[PDB]
Design an enzyme around this catalytic site. Structure first.
Site, PDB file in Angstrom:
ATOM      1  CG  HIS A  69      -2.649  90.361  -5.364  1.00 26.75           C
ATOM      2  ND1 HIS A  69      -1.957  89.104  -4.861  1.00 26.75           N
ATOM      3  CD2 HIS A  69      -2.424  91.209  -6.264  1.00 26.75           C
ATOM      4  CE1 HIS A  69      -1.565  88.856  -6.282  1.00 26.75           C
ATOM      5  NE2 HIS A  69      -0.996  89.772  -6.462  1.00 26.75           N
ATOM      6  CD  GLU A  72      -5.151  88.373  -2.732  1.00 28.87           C
ATOM      7  OE1 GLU A  72      -4.406  88.827  -1.694  1.00 28.87           O
ATOM      8  OE2 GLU A  72      -5.019  87.942  -3.761  1.00 28.87           O
ATOM      9  NE  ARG A 127      -2.886  89.010  -9.844  1.00 21.28           N
ATOM     10  CZ  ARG A 127      -3.149  87.295  -8.576  1.00 21.28           C
ATOM     11  NH1 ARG A 127      -4.331  86.418  -8.432  1.00 21.28           N
ATOM     12  NH2 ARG A 127      -1.990  86.559  -8.310  1.00 21.28           N
ATOM     13  CG  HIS A 196      -1.035  87.556  -0.418  1.00 24.32           C
ATOM     14  ND1 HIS A 196      -1.939  88.054  -2.306  1.00 24.32           N
ATOM     15  CD2 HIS A 196      -0.063  88.292  -0.357  1.00 24.32           C
ATOM     16  CE1 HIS A 196      -0.257  88.792  -2.573  1.00 24.32           C
ATOM     17  NE2 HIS A 196       1.240  88.535  -0.946  1.00 24.32           N
ATOM     18  CD  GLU A 270      -2.671  83.709  -0.586  1.00 21.42           C
ATOM     19  OE1 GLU A 270      -3.890  83.914  -0.456  1.00 21.42           O
ATOM     20  OE2 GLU A 270      -1.144  83.434  -1.313  1.00 21.42           O
TER      21      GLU A 270
HETATM   22 CU   LIG Z   1      -2.785  82.583  -3.399  1.00 19.77          CU
HETATM   23 HG   LIG Z   2      -2.624  87.676  -3.594  1.00 16.78          HG
END
Ligand SMILES: [Cu+2]
Ligand SMILES: [Hg+2]
Ligand SMILES: [Hg+2]
Ligand SMILES: [Hg+2]
Ligand SMILES: [Hg+2]
Length: 307
Positions: A69, A72, A127, A196, A270
């Site tokens: 993504h 990020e 994204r 992420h 994350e």
């Molecule tokens: Cu998430």
């Molecule tokens: Hg992500």
């Protein structure tokens, strides 16, 4: 810039600078790292994975991907920091040294290069990939909804303009197919980590089904340990659990796929923060983020070597 030693790790960089960084690194540590191209993006940019290894043929390996993504940015920045760290720590850190003496590590710093460029050029928050088509003016697919693990189920959108569009069929995006074929051909992956941001979570499968994985006790203990290591440096608090119980139902995600391929240690991280800055995390948090994530990642790798 002229050497990885002068590269500024405390700032965010463009695609070209990251690609240049890879060549410098390989140049400086030829006996440890090599640059492999495993595909080309929709818009034709090469897709590169750095292989870290001390020898052997087909040694058990660890896959690490970042930046699927694109917006990020903390993730690609962490990826460059990790690449450097591996080269510095080999031979100095007993633990890491043992890991690399027995396993190889594959690192994909920019998993979605077209989206990444787009974030520098036109939309910082982009994204998806940049694949187009026919029955829509909307561009792009959520590469983390395109894998073959409950593809198309609740937890992804079928509308092309959605931020979570799953695409036409599993593995329709080249950026995803490339990893799939590479992992399947290698066949000796023992761990698969996808990085992420943001939320401070450490997740294990599954996201597409309420069904519990058979190794749930172990992964959970692993995650707990990793989270404990990570918190140790700056006090960063992470929660952990299966994707569906911790976040929401999500289908077609990478770790669901890898786990179903038999790669037991499959986790998604994350990174920081919890919302204050979100995707726009300040440059000043690069290094601390990277350092604390390493501790977490290293704990999973250790587990892996010994199991
Ligand atoms: Cu998430
Ligand atoms: Hg992500
Ligand atoms: Hg070296
Ligand atoms: Hg170096
Ligand atoms: Hg450093």
């Amino acid at each position: 810039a002229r050497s990885t030693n002068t590269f500024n790790y405390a700032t965010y960089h463009t695609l070209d600078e990251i690609y240049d960084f890879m060549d410098l690194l390989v140049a400086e540590h030829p006996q440890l790292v090599s640059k492999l191209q495993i595909g080309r993006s929709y818009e034709g940019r090469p897709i590169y994975v750095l292989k870290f290894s001390t020898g052997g043929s087909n040694r058990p390996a660890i896959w690490i991907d970042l930046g699927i993504h694109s917006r990020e940015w903390i993730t690609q920045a962490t990826g460059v920091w990790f690449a450097k760290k591996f080269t510095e720590d080999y031979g100095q850190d007993p633990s890491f040294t043992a890991i690399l003496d027995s396993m190889d590590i594959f690192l994909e710093i920019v998993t979605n290069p077209d989206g990444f460029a787009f974030t520098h050029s036109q939309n910082r928050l982009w994204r998806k990939t940049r694949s187009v088509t026919s029955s829509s003016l909307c561009v792009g697919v959520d590469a983390n909804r395109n894998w073959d693990a409950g593809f198309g189920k609740a937890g992804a959108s079928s509308s092309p303009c959605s931020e979570t569009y799953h695409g036409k069929y599993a593995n329709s995006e080249v950026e995803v197919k490339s990893i799939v074929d590479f992992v399947k051909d290698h066949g000796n992956f023992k761990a698969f980590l996808s990085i992420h941001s943001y939320s401070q979570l450490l997740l294990y499968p599954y996201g597409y089904t309420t069904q519990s994985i058979p190794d749930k006790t172990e992964l959970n203990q692993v995650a707990k340990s990793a989270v404990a290591a990570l918190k140790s440096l700056y006090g960063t608090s992470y929660k952990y659990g299966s994707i569906i119980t911790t976040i929401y139902q999500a289908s077609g995600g990478s770790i669901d796929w890898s786990y179903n391929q038999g790669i037991k240690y499959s986790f998604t991280f994350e990174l920081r923060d919890t919302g204050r800055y979100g995707f726009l995390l300040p440059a000043s948090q690069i290094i601390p983020t990277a350092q604390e994530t390493w501790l977490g990642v290293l704990t999973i790798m250790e587990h892996t070597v010994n199991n």
